[PDB]
Every structure is written in structure tokens, then in C-alpha cells.
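Lab notebook, entry 210. We have the chain sequence and a SMILES string for 2-acetamido-2-deoxy-beta-D-glucopyranose, and the next step in the workflow is to get a structural model of the bound complex before anyone spends time on docking refinements. Request logged below.

Task: model protein plus 2-acetamido-2-deoxy-beta-D-glucopyranose, output C-alpha cells.
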Amino acid sequence: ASVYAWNRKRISNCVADYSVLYNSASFSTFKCYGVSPTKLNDLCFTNVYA
Amino acid sequence: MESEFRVYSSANNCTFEYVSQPFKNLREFVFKNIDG
Amino acid sequence: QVQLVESGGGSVQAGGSLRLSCAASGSISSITYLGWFRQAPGKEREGVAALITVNGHTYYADSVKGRFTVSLDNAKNTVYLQMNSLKPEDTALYYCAAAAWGYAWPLHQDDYWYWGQGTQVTVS
Ligand SMILES: *[C@@H]1O[C@H](CO)[C@@H](O)[C@H](O)[C@H]1NC(C)=O
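Result returned:
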């Protein structure tokens, strides 16, 4: 999507593993505000819009 | 005479969907809503 | 909560070898990312080396690519920086930084880092 139309999509009732994001070997700036990335997969939160 | 659909005409602002699988017959249900 | 004490500096002729270390004390398991900084005289402090503690992936700048390597020792909680094939443009102040928010390449001064005391590396 574009920056004039980046939709607030509700993708619900799923899972999302981030260990395959951790070993993707292509990330430049991985910044997780509020909570640490090491405790991101085991504990989650609501309102998981992307 | 096998299909009729005039119950709504509105398709904006959907949030959730769910699709599953379903006198002689007696059917029972209970509908309640506690804390979301 | 993260305290870094670094050492391993000194003077050597160009073409020699040196080895820096940066000992980490405190919340070791919260540290996710080790970055090595370098500030030349008359220049802004830039980034040289990078290390992810979880994955082990290394990132290097273009001026130090093929000559500089970085390694982690989890038993001593100390990151290592080995310098091979040194040139006299590397005379600078070196710093070690520990991150607890994730990994970001390239290194930037304005982000939150736990900063070391700094050491002098002089080559000629
Ligand atoms: C769609 O619903 C959300 C939830 O209240 C609301 O904030 C939004 O304004 C609605 N959009 C339109 C176009 O009415």
C-alpha cells in the first residue's frame, strides 16, 4: 500500500511467529517501543492492527 | 422459489467474520453476554 | 541498569593487531545488541561494528569491511573486537554500546545507548 492509502487493516484470529523474523538476516532497523523484543512472542496484547 | 434475499443493503465498516458448518425436531439455545 | 567497562587499548604500528574488550555487568539478559563506535579527531562519532546477541549476525561498515571482526563471549559477558591489517586512518577514540530495545543498523548517536568510558587507540 501507499502512504496516502496505508489502510488500518484488521487481521484477526491468527498467530504470528517472530523468530523467523529474527533469523531473516535482512533487517536494518528493528525498533520495538514500550516492550522488549525478547519478550514479544511469549506475551501478547490486544488491538493488533498493522 | 428457492432463493430470496431482501434483508439488508449495507456493506461498509466490517470488523469480524466467521464461517463454520451447521413436528419432529426440537432445537434449544441459550444466549447470554458477560464481560465481552 | 547496564554498566560497561572497556579495556584493551594501546599503541601499535600499522599492519599490527590489537584486541578490544567491553565487559558487561548488570541486566545481561536484557541486552540485545552490541555496537562499536569510533570518533576520529575532527570527525563525528560513527559506527564500525554491530552484533546481535540473540542471532549472532554481524554488520560492518565499508571502511572496516574485510579487516575488522566482532565476536561475543557469553561465559564472560564480554564482547570482543579484533583488529587486523591496521592503517593510520584508524587513530580514534573507540566506544562500546549496549542496547536493550532491539537492533538498528547503521549506528546512531541520538538513540538510547548504555555508553562505555572510552579508550584511545593510536596507530601510525
Ligand atoms: C468505521 O467504524 C469505526 C469504529 O467506530 C469508526 O471509528 C469509523 O469512523 C467508521 N468509519 C466510517 C467511514 O464511518
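Notes for the group: The helical segments of chain A are 19-22. Worth checking against the assay data. The interface with chain C takes residues 22-23, 25, 27-33, 36-38 of chain A (CB under 8 Å).
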